[PDB]
Design a protein around this nucleic acid. Structure first.
Ligand SMILES: [Mg+2]
Ligand SMILES: [Mg+2]
Ligand SMILES: [Mg+2]
Length: 176
RNA sequence: UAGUUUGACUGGGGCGGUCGCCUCCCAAAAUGUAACGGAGGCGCCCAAAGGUCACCUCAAGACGGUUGGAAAUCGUCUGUAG
């Protein structure tokens, strides 16, 4: 908790020194961290989908919500109004913890050349994150969770400039 | 054996089709207006698809992304409505 706030307060002068803003509020900040499970790659019965909501909830200390299918009957087993993937917003203390879970000791570090190769491009916030697999926890035991879905995790931050995206990882404990 | 019934429109009768209600064009910028003229629906539904109170905003595109990738799902930008 206090460590994430200290890294925020160390980043903000670091950005005012690499790029002076008139205001600390002009500095980039991190708004929310979202994690989107998408069990439409493995649509199931209530059993498996509630189990995946169960595992994200155990990871989060939050209740995940189900995103529900849009009107879009299609070739690909698509229907009308049915679940098609969990979603979890995080703001406040529940958010920063996860990032401090990920920057520091709670990182699985199961695989890492560097950080995921940069994707925001335009440099305003939206830093999308792909976890190809969830063999990345001590929360699971692999023989029982022999299924391994992936995860999407989008970082949302203010940033009116492209290069300023470099601030949200380099000084934020993320490899670049 | 007996008393009867056996529909109409119909560019002649028959055959085919049609017979009630709703929508559009025809319909000539009022209302109305024919055709066996051009198109298509209804003979139901909903214990909530009502009353009320309160709250949300939709398509679609592009950039980015986990088993998905032309289109699952999340994320930003545009977005009097497509
Ligand atoms: Mg006659
Ligand atoms: Mg008239
Ligand atoms: Mg007349």
């Amino acid at each position: 908790q206090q460590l994430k706030t200290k890294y925020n307060d160390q980043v903000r002068p670091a950005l005012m020194q690499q790029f002076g803003y008139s205001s600390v509020m002009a500095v980039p900040r991190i708004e929310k961290i979202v994690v989107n499970e998408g069990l439409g790659s493995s649509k199931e019965d209530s059993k498996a989908i509630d189990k995946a909501a169960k595992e994200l909830a155990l990871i989060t200390l939050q209740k995940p919500i189900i995103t529900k299918a849009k009107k879009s009957i299609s070739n690909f087993k698509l229907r009308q109004g049915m679940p098609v993937g969990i979603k979890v917003t995080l703001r406040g203390e529940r958010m920063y913890v996860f990032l401090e879970k990920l920057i520091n000791i709670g990182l699985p570090r199961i695989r890492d050349f560097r950080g995921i190769n940069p994707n925001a491009f335009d440099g305003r916030g939206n830093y999308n994150l792909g976890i190809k697999e969830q063999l990345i926890f001590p929360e699971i035991t692999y023989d029982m969770v022999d299924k391994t879905r992936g995860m999407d995790i989008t970082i949302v931050t203010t940033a009116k400039t492209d290069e300023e995206a470099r601030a949200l990882l380099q000084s934020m404990g993320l490899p670049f």
